[PDB]
Design a protein around this nucleic acid. Structure first.
Ligand SMILES: [Mg+2]
Ligand SMILES: [Mg+2]
Ligand SMILES: [Mg+2]
Ligand SMILES: [Mg+2]
Lengths: 227, 141, 206, 320, 106, 67
RNA sequence: UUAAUUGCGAUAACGAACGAGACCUUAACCUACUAAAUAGGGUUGCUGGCACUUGCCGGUUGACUCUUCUUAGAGGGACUAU
């Protein structure tokens, strides 16, 4: 519509937040991991990265279908203007959000907190990231509040690369006694970080010089003259 | 075409754009004779480069300076810088290297910012105070 | 005397032969002498200027504050009372008037007069907080030349302002008469009176 | 034996960055263009009035970074400046305005070589390439053949080789420790001259052009026959060198050693003088070293440029 | 017959920069390989959009405040161009994030 | 208040140890060398590296030093 | 020694991790590049007034041209350089 560019951009951002919170609310049981919104002149496609792709897809692709209508019903988009795409996550180990939701689900089943967290961190290391941390706060088996940290590798805390590589997620878990806060931090390997710097700011890479034998002192040479 | 060059001078926001041509000693800022800058006390300052070198240095030159922004003292200093920079640029480009040399020597020999721009620039106000490095007050009791 | 034609006609007194830089095109820094041998190199009459207002970086370094023209330091120190912290144009107008007054009173080209007033009103001995808590005492200490200059400026301007406060007499003329009193040993000046008081307290507490 | 000792006459100042290069117009005696780290080409008029030998004329602003090499045109009206601002600039020496900006390198440019007469432009650059430009600004040829930065390319003078050849030969060098001389029309490769144990910084052909000299960190100077295609001699400067210049008339060679300037009489293969002027307050390790050399057309005056932002004139007067 | 010059005008928008810059690069490269007359990718003051908020949700604590922002870049362009090639250019090479608008200048 | 912390010194020292024949007394030249021969993210760090390498070149020219 | 657990070093300590820095935003410098009627400037039209010598000051979605100033991208620039 006739809307200022800044207002329209803010509206697009808050619509992005709309969908993100929606998918976190509903698709969590199916392993929602992230959302993207891409727009062509024709249609506004929504690309939904999730762990368990089929359950999001549902039986015979019904589930995706309903979600589309909800969007077109909630945000007043005309029929066929917006479609939904489901893709498998490139790797569930790196996406911290999937890991934190796995934590919450495994706690829902009533698992050992330390065992669950160490399984998560071991999985993160297996996935190849160069550092993991999981923090659990709340009523850990007692009444007085506690907050235990379970870390491995190493994590950088300060400096803009914190946003450049370290993914972070936070979740609330509902146990009978109350709420447990889980925080997941994953420090993505700079080597395999697309769309950003390929190394840490202070990572200096000296290059090996190729060697040559210097004995060829006199060595007069001649080529044939060329036009 | 007439040998003519354009320069600029600044004071924190104030920008004076000067165009200098081969003319007849025409000196107008904002299309007005240079004698009429309002500070009236900073008035000598707008003359300030000229008297260092002597107006005879520009008898076949005409200078027109359009200036915007800033307050008033900033405006005047920007005008000064524009005039000096224009003289230097024209003399360097069309007259001789040594000419520009004595001009630079005379200018720099007096109030160095007369030729060189001042970099002294305000910085943002942090929260917690009325100024960039001021705090409100404390009670303690 | 050698005027130059241009498209814009610069006035007479500005265009004539003014490669002889003057303070306000009126008073010359030549013939201005520094009596005390100390405070030379702490007053910049060697540098000629056409206005008493040149916004330069004169406080970033330890000692570049001394390179400031003395008249500009006086100007910048006129503005006190907090409310009138800025408005240098006001200060430069006041000081220009005061230079004219000094030109009236005892023609003696005023810059020499103000320099002499600065030299005279400097306190050569000060006191220091030394007594520890119980038996408080007042220690006698020698003073820095640069501090003498700065102190002289402060006491002169303070005397001028206190003379002008809620008073029919104006700041320009009160400053002028204080400078006149300070060129000689006229104790009627508040500045020299305070300088004497400080000297005496230092001396009595050697 | 050969009692000819040159003496300094004066100094030329005005540069605020190191005197990287010098260049003398053949047609005009008193003209001298000098490039500096100050990005400003200064044109100097030589005056026989007083201690100042030369006097500046025009400063050529238009360079954002280091100006490395300077070359004058045959007439004495154009000059080509190589800069580290990723461009070449062609300047008219009378008006003082650059008319051509040669663009396209990826490593910053280092060397310039003018055509034999006027037509072509030869440039060397860190991008491991040598660019053959036209006079207006377009690049015609992109010579490849060096794996490392090419430090300097200089056109071999054509004295009388055949009446007419229809070919323009020149020389090139870099840190590849190999010197590649080239021919230009069409305009393809020719022989390599592999001599240097450590890498080369300057090559400058003899005034006839059939002889050339190369030198570098090692202090060894390899002087070579171009058409004869044979190594002539291997001197050693015992010191890192910066620039070598052939004297025009004498069978000599000036060299910009790190310590001072070494003049070699090539015929006798013996040095005949060292240049070590006097400075105050320099504790024997901060001695400014010569980085620009220029022999005037007569061969009786030498122009040198150190890092002290100074250009000295060494008049070659006979000591009886 | 659609030979009439259209004076077509494009305007871009992007929260970020590099996508906008490469989109403009693609548009200009397409126009130039199509032999079109263009007024270059003019640069407009990136409008900063700032919000200052209190960090604490409850007001307790020392007064501490933060400033979130975006920086929007518009950078319109314009062509003296026919229809079909240009309208096809408009409908191609769009990446996410960058928003494109077209006005015909009719 | 500049003291050039561990990273700049260690990277420089490595650069000397590997390329001493390819360094010079100059800064600008050594600046371009260190830029070309090693990958440094921010140019401020590259400038610092070049400065330390130049200081080490001057030290070596004056006399051999430990480490 | 630094602002710094910052380094020089000495060393039953050795090598490593976080914090500091490094890093990002902003402020400054770019008569170098890319461009611009949603920013400017020059020339030149057509016009207004004055001095009348062709000079100024103005107006004018006219025409041409330019980008120093204004913009924002690529970048350059300082690292304590000498
Ligand atoms: Mg760190
Ligand atoms: Mg305030
Ligand atoms: Mg920091
Ligand atoms: Mg510009």
């Amino acid at each position: 519509a006739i809307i200022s560019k800044k207002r329209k951009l803010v509206a697009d951002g808050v619509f992005y937040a709309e969908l993100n919170e929606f998918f976190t609310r509903e698709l969590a049981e199916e392993g929602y991991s992230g959302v993207e919104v891409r727009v062509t002149p024709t249609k506004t496609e929504i690309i939904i990265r999730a762990t368990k792709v089929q359950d999001v897809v549902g039986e015979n692709g019904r589930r995706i279908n309903e979600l589309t209508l909800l969007i077109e019903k909630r945000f007043k988009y005309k029929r066929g203007t917006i479609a939904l795409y489901a893709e498998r996550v490139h790797d569930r180990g790196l996406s911290a959000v999937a890991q934190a939701e796995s934590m919450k689900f495994k706690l829902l089943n009533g698992l050992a907190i330390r065992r669950a967290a160490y399984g998560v961190v071991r999985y993160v290391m297996e996935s190849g990231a160069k550092g993991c941390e999981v923090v659990i706060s709340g009523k850990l088996r007692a009444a007085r509040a506690k907050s235990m940290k379970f870390a491995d590798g190493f994590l950088i805390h300060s400096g803009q690369p914190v946003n450049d590589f370290i993914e972070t997620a936070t979740r609330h878990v509902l146990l009978r006694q109350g709420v447990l806060g889980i925080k997941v931090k994953i420090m993505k390997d700079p080597s395999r970080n697309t769309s950003g710097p390929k190394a840490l700011p202070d990572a200096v890479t000296i290059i090996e010089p190729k060697e040559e034998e210097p004995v060829l002192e006199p060595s007069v040479k001649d080529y044939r003259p060329t036009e | 075409t007439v040998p003519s060059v354009q320069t600029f001078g600044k004071k924190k926001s104030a920008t004076a754009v000067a165009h200098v041509k081969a003319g007849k000693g025409l000196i107008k800022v904002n299309g007005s004779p240079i004698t009429l800058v309002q500070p009236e006390i900073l008035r000598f300052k707008v003359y300030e480069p000229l008297l260092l070198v002597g107006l005879d240095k520009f008898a076949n030159i005409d200078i027109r300076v359009k200036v915007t922004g800033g307050g008033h003292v900033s405006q005047v200093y920007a005008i000064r810088q524009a005039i000096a920079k224009g003289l230097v640029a024209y003399h360097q480009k069309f007259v001789d290297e040594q000419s520009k040399n004595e001009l630079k020597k005379a200018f720099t020999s007096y109030d160095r910012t007369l030729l060189i721009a001042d970099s002294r620039r305000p910085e943002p106000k942090k929260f917690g105070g009325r100024g960039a490095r001021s705090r409100f007050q404390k009670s303690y009791r | 005397f050698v005027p130059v034609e241009l498209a814009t006609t610069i006035p007479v007194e500005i265009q004539q032969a003014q490669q002889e830089i003057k303070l306000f095109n009126k008073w010359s820094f030549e013939d201005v002498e520094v009596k005390d041998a100390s405070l030379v190199d702490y007053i910049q009459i060697s540098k000629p200027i056409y206005v008493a207002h040149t916004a330069g970086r004169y406080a970033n370094k330890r000692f570049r504050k001394a390179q400031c023209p003395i008249v500009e330091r006086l100007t910048n120190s006129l503005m006190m009372n907090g409310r009138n912290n800025g408005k240098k144009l006001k200060a430069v107008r006041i000081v220009k008037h005061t230079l004219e007054i000094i030109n009236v009173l005892t023609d003696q080209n005023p810059l020499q007069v103000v320099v002499d007033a600065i030299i005279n009103s400097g306190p050569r001995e000060d006191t220091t907080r030394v007594g520890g808590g119980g038996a408080a005492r007042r220690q006698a200490v020698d003073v820095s030349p640069l501090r003498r200059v700065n102190q002289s400026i402060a006491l002169l301007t303070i005397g001028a302002r206190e003379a002008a406060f809620r008073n029919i007499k104006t700041i320009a003329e009160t400053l002028a008469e204080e400078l006149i009193n300070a060129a000689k040993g006229s104790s009627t000046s508040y500045a020299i009176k305070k300088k004497d008081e400080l000297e005496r307290v230092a001396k009595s507490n050697r | 034996s050969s009692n000819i000792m040159l003496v300094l006459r004066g100094t030329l100042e005005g540069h605020n960055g190191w005197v990287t290069s010098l260049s003398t117009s053949a047609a005009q005696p008193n003209l001298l263009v000098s490039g500096s780290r100050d990005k400003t080409l200064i044109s100097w008029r030589l005056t026989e009035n007083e201690q100042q030998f030369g006097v500046p004329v025009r400063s050529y602003k238009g360079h954002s970074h280091i100006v490395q090499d300077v070359v004058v045109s045959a007439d004495g009206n154009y000059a080509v400046s190589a800069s580290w601002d990723k461009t070449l600039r062609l300047w008219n020496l009378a008006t003082g305005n650059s008319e051509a900006r040669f663009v396209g390198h990826t490593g910053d440019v280092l060397s310039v070589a003018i055509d034999a007469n006027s037509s072509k432009i030869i440039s060397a650059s860190r991008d491991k390439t040598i660019r053959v430009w036209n006079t207006v600004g377009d690049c015609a040829y992109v010579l490849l053949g060096h794996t490392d930065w090419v430090t300097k390319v200089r056109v071999a003078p054509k004295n009388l080789e055949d009446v007419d050849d229809g070919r323009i030969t020149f020389v090139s060098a870099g840190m590849d420790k190999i010197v590649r001389s080239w021919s230009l029309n069409s305009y393809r490769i020719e022989a390599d001259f592999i001599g240097h144990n450590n890498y080369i910084n300057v090559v400058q052909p003899s005034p006839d052009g059939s002889l050339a000299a190369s030198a570098g960190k090692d202090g060894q100077i390899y002087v070579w026959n171009l058409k004869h295609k044979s190594a002539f001699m291997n001197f050693d400067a015992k010191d890192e060198v910066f620039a070598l210049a052939f004297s025009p008339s004498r069978f000599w060679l000036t060299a910009a050693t790190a310590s001072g300037i070494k003049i070699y009489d090539l015929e006798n293969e013996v040095l005949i003088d060292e240049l070590k002027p006097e400075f105050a307050g320099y504790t024997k390790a901060q001695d400014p070293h010569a980085v620009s050399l220029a022999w005037s057309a007569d061969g009786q005056t030498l122009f040198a440029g150190y890092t002290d932002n100074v250009i000295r004139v060494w008049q070659v007067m006979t000591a009886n | 017959q659609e030979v009439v010059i259209h004076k077509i005008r494009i305007n871009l928008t992007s929260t970020k920069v590099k996508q906008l810059e490469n989109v403009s690069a693609n548009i200009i490269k397409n126009a130039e390989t199509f032999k079109l007359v263009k007024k270059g990718p003019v640069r407009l003051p990136t409008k900063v959009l700032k919000i200052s908020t209190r960090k604490t949700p409850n007001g307790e604590g020392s007064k501490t405040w933060d400033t979130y922002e975006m920086r929007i870049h518009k950078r319109y362009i314009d062509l003296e161009a026919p229809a079909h090639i240009v309208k096809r250019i408009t409908q191609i090479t769009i990446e996410p994030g960058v928003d494109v608008e077209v006005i015909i200048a009719a | 208040g500049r003291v050039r912390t561990k990273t700049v010194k260690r990277a420089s020292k490595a650069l000397i140890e590997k390329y001493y024949p390819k360094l010079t007394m100059d800064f600008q030249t050594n600046k371009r060398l260190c830029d070309e021969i090693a990958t440094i993210q921010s140019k401020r760090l590259r400038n610092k590296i070049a400065g330390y390498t130049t200081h080490l070149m001057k030290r070596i020219q004056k006399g051999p030093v430990r480490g």
